[PDB]
Design a protein around this nucleic acid. Sequence first.
RNA 1: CAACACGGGGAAACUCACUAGUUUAAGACAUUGGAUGGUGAUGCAUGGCCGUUUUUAGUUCGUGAAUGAUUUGUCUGGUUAAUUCCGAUAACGAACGAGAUCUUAACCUGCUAAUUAGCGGCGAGUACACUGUACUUGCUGCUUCUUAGAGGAACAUUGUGUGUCUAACACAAGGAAGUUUAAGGCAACAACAGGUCUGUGAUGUCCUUAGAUGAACUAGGCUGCACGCGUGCUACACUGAUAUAUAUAACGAGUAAAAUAUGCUUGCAUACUUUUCCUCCGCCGAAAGGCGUAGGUAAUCUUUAUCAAUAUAUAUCGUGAUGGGGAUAGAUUAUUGCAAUUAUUAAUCUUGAACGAGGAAUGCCUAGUAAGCAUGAUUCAUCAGAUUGUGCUAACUACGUC
Lengths: 48, 98, 154, 41, 157, 79, 138, 54
Amino acid sequence: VHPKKYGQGSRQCRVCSNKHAIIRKYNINICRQCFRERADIIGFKKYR
Amino acid sequence: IALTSKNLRAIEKVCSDIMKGAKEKNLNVSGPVRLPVKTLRITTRKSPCGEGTNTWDRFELRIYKRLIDLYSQCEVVTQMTSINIDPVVEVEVIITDS
Amino acid sequence: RLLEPVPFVKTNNCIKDVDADLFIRSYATHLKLHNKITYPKWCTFVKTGKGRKLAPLNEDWYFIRASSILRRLYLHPDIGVGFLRRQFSSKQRRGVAPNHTSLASGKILRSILQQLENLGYVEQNPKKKGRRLTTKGENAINNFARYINKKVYN
Amino acid sequence: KLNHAVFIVITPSAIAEKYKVNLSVARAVINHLADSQKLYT
Amino acid sequence: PISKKRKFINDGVFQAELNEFLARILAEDGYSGVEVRIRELTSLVQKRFFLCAMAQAESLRYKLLKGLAVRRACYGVLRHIMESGAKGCEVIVSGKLRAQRAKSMKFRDGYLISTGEPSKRFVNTATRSAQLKQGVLGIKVKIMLPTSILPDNISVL
Amino acid sequence: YSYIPKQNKKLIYEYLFKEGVIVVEKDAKIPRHPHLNVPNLHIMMTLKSLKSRNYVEEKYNWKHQYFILNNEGIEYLRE
Amino acid sequence: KRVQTFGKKKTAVAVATVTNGKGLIKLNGKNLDLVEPYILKTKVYEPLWLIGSGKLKNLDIRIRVKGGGQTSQIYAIRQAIGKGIISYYQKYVDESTKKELKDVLLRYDRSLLVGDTRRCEPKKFGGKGARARYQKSY
Amino acid sequence: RVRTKTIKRAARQIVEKYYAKLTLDFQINKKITEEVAIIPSKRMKNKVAGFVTH
RNA sequence: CAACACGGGGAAACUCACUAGUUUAAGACAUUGGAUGGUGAUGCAUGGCCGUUUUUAGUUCGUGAAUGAUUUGUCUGGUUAAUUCCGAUAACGAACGAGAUCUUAACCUGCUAAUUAGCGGCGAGUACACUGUACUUGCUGCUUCUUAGAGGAACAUUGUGUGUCUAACACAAGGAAGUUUAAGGCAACAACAGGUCUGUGAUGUCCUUAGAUGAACUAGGCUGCACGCGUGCUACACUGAUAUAUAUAACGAGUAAAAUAUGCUUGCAUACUUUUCCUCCGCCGAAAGGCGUAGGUAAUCUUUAUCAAUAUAUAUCGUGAUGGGGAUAGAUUAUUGCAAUUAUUAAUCUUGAACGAGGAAUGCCUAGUAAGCAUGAUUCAUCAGAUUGUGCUAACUACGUC
């Protein structure tokens, strides 16, 4: 091994480990495809 | 005493409870101060593969903060707080008064 | 254009009664006449901000800018250098790409700020942020305001 | 075209037409007469 | 410590993670309360941090796994939901359905409501994937129950 | 240079018996766990073997691996 | 003593403080003279003509402005002055004189008596505007 | 504009049992309709009051 | 079309699946058999989700009635966004959808409240002016404005026409508002062999599974370039460029590496302390940028009674590819990172292409919109010409028709 501490390989979706479409806003760290399943149980609701 | 919640009804229920609670020991209160609402807004694309018309929907987690404060000794307010609690709301006690 | 009749009463003693440009130029000219202010040397060569690229093309511009800063000081009490950089901001043409905001050069601002302070017109306190006005400078600004106010009036 | 040289109703364009000169040269003539945009009335 | 905005999301994420953990366990009932059989489960979560639709749907997916006929199973489950006091219900079974060529079949009864926020308020919902012998069925259960009543009621005495 | 770590396996077995459960997540690169400073990979391989032999039950939710030691597993493990 | 009103076009809000006085008009820390654009200078001079000097001459006006750009702010100021003038004559002077004054103001325009009804429509995905959309293609 | 079947049906029930409480005025009818029928929305109540007044 | 700034997919490495190769065990069970994994194959095996069908009024049931598929109900007619209502009628009565509901924005309660908002009350100064005004430090009953709760307000209200003079429509007045007030959200029936197994320990079957299509590591590649078509940006000047001045905004968003001290042989080990996301402020720097520090879990500090740019005001050009334009290139010092060398990004000076308002074609738009002008957020170690929000500057033209 030889580690990389920054950029794409430093992070993932916490739920699915995929590296794509990740919401890091408010430090959620979930990809939106996973997040839209759970956003209600997380406590969000859409209105607009 | 600061009250933070994501649920309107629960925070309002706590408001009525604290108003009664204050009058039980006949305390001198400043009226409940509702602090500016923070909304945790996520504007989210619909489709897991990004299909069709682009199509975004806007999700909101809206948290309510309120503060009600009291000029009273430290023991009285903490004991009042412990009788007044319910699980859902987040309570912070900042009173050093006498 | 220069003066119009109006029915309402005015304060008649402050920059809040004055044509900003006329005031700025007059005080700059007065300051240069007095010779308290200096350009100096290197500041003849410099550029005023990358949003411009150029420079004011007037040779008395530093005194004008100093005077303009002093007016901002009268408006806004405890402001500092980053506030000044932001104050004098404009748009910058990014070549083929669209505009984004660009600061005025910070050394000329810093130099003016220091120079006014050395000449006693402003005072940095331990309290709050930056430099506020000294009373002597304020009274002079008021006197110049009074001169202009009389000059237009009669 | 040929409307530009140094030597020989108030409004600069008319002056520039009349003597066949630039608007800078017209403005200079206005300034000599007097002895953005401006008010000529 | 961290912001309220950070705090509330972290609480929500944890709530989802525990709920999904519970969903892997689930059989007897939907829930049995937080603790600040069950003893071992409590021990696992304490280590880690240091009627309603879903029960009916889960019952149905177990019956599909047991190899009972889909139509008979769905009819029974639907009937139980209505009998037990649902004001309406819709159960959809999607997928292979004893063939290579997939299809879906809807089984609704009662006043099942889809329109507006009253639908969201009074319709309780559950989704289940059944992996079976030939591939996969998706069950989607919707149960409509009061908690007061629909706004379409005129309410004249 | 270094080989298979039996002493670490012995330590892991003791920890497993004492608790009767382990929650520790999937990833093998990390070696830090609140009760353990030995690599996750070593424990994970042993847990896989124990599960296969039916001395452990898995429950699994997105990298959370919820391992419980079985009564037959407790008796066998104890020494 | 004191009477209070406000004016509200788009974001902008101009609150008017009308006290017993002598004919002074301010905008925050600044005299009314410092509006600057000639057109918008007239827009706030307009109510001054409608009430004349001698009805202005026993009141001072101070106005407090937040939000919007200049054209919106000046219309908010103008509305605040209109309502302000009326409120002083309703609280201190006379209802009949206030009605007479309001008639004059109404004859000039509605906009210094009743605020704007126009407010922004949100952007929606698929175009730069509220309604305007990105180009279709074949 | 118009008025839907729910509004008309509610209005038809009214008068039939309640004409002796009804009046010409809309604001009083709004009060009467609120008093008599436990309508869940203001909009709905106003429409029923309006049509009952009509 | 509804593929084509679309795959939230703004690729230096990491990324990556590709190309050149270098490695590795991370082979459960009794090194041999054996299994276990796969951003491999299969969306015409499938689940889920999303798109279309389609932003429009359509769908269905109970019983009755009409060799049968089938039909009535669900309609001559009036009316409506409306299987909306009236009305009519082998049907009568329903249920779903729509409407109602829900989120904003719009206006009003000498009602509800005052903190981390204001106002006054009142001390202290510096200026100005008189039978008060302006400005800062110091202390401290009101709630109109700041915030955020509850509650009101349109029902076609009144009037006049039109309309079976029924459901209803039209105009004017009143009114903060008169189309369901304007904008959203939610989105049936029944489909499509639309897209997605490269989002998922959702997943069948198939390939492969240790000179591995796994994991991991080093380069190169994704931006290549005789060339063709989409979507966007910037221009073609004088109602403009250039330089000063005056004004100002809403939505926001913000907390395990490194450094230093000690012991040892520039290196290592141990100890110990900050930075970490936002940076006011103060020094130094043309500039980028640097250094020193302070407040920030946030109505408090960055910073928002002011954080933008077009506006607007005075000056300089003066119609000439012109000082328009900024393509293209050279020389710098910075910045992020191990790595910038396919100009990463940044500024400084110079360099000064096409383009003289766009042919055939064709897009979007009706009121705070359209257009122009900005800017926050998203990705982000490193980066907006993208997307998604938000504001300011505030148009034209019917106001309808098939």
